[PDB]
Amino acid sequence: AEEEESGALRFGVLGPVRAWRDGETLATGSPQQRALLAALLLREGRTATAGELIDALWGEEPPSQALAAVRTYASRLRKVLDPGVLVSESGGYAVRGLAEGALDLARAQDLASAAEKARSAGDLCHARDLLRRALDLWDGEVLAGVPGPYAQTQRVRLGEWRLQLLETRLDMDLDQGCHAEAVSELTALTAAHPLRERLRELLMLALYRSGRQAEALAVYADTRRLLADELGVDPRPGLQELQQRILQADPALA
DNA sequence: CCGGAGCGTTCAGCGTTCGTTTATCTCCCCCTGGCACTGTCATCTCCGTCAGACCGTCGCA
C-alpha cells in the first residue's frame, strides 16, 4: 500500500493474469490472450517476433493462417492497455514503460537478491522480513489457465524456484530458532508433495530438535518404501548421513 | 421394517464466450515518372622480374 504511486500500472504473473491500473482491474481476456500477455511479461520487454510468440502460445502445431489471430490479440491488448505501453518493431511485440514494482516477478528477484545479500551480511531480521514479503507475492498456482508447452516450461521453472525459496526460508527459520511453524509448513508441503527428498531432510532437521523422533523415522520409512516402489534405488548419501548423526544424538548443532 | 431425506453421480435444456477468420483503415515502403537558359571526348597506368623458352609473327633476302 505504501508503494501505490499515482499512474502506476502493476502486472502480475506469480499469481493469475491480472492488471491493476491505479486500483481498478483490466479485463485481460481470453486464455490464449492471457498466455500472450504473460509471454510478453516474462521477457522483461523484448521485441519478440511473431513466429516466436506463435510458438509460445501453441507450440508444434499452431493453425496455419493464425498470424492475423495473434495480430488481433495484439489489438485486444492495445485497446485494453495503454496505446503506448505496447509498441511493435519489425513485426515483433514489446511491452515497455514498466517501472520498479510494476512486475511481481522483478520484485521477486529483487527480494531474493536482497535476502541473499542479508544472508551474506549475516543479518536475520531484515532477511526474514524480505522473504516474508516474498512469500506474499505468489497467489495460488502460477500461470492459472494458460495453454502452451512454453507456459508449462516457465510454470515448472517458477514452481522449482518457489521450492528452493521455501527451502531457504525453512532453513533460516530452523537456524534462527523457529520450529513450530517450521514443522507445520514442512508437514503441509510433504502432504502436498510427497516425493521431495530435501523437504523430508528438512523435516528430519526440524523434528530432530523440536522434540519429535518416532514419527520422523516413520515418515522416513514411508519415504524409503515409496522410493523403492516407484524408483527402486537408494536415496542420497547426505540423507542417510543426516539420519546417522541423528542416531548418536549429537548436541553440537543445538 | 421398508420410507424418507440427504447425498453422489450423470447427463440434456438454454446462455455467453472463447477459437479462429475477414475485410477496413493509417503508415510506411517502393517502383515508375519528371524536371525545359546553356553547359557536346576523360582516364592514368607502365619501367631497376627473369629466365629461357615457345611460339607465331613478319619484314628482309
Protein residues in reach of strand B (CB < 7 A): A 29-33, 63-66, 68-69, 72-73, 147
Task: Give the separation between CA A87 and CA A92, rounded to whole angstroms.
Answer: 9
- CA-based nearest residue to A124, from A184, A104, A132, A179: A132
* Cα A219 to Cα A239: distance, rounded to the nearest angstrom: 13
* A62: nt with nearest C1' to CA: B20
Per-residue CA distances from A64 to A67, A73, A150, A191, A224 (Å): 8, 16, 19, 44, 50
The secondary structure element, H or E, covering residue A186 is: helix A180-192
- Listed as ranges, the nucleotides of chain B within 7 A of a protein C-beta are 17-23
Technique behind this structure? Answer: cryo-EM
Q: Classify residue A170 by burial, with Cβ atoms within 10 Å: 0-12, 13-18, 19+.
A: buried
Q: C1' nearest to CA of A57: which nucleotide?
A: B19
C-alpha cell, A220: 522416513
The sign of the torsion formed by the CA atoms of A58, A60, A61, A66 equals positive
What is the grid cell recorded at A123? 543479518
DSSP 8-state assignment for residue A1: -
CA dist., res. A11 & res. A98, Å (int): 9
Question: How far in angstroms lies nucleotide B34's C1' from the CA of residue A91?
Answer: 35
Tell me how long chain A is.
254
Residue nearest B17, CA–C1′ metric: A30
Closest-lying nucleotide for A34 based on CA to C1': B18
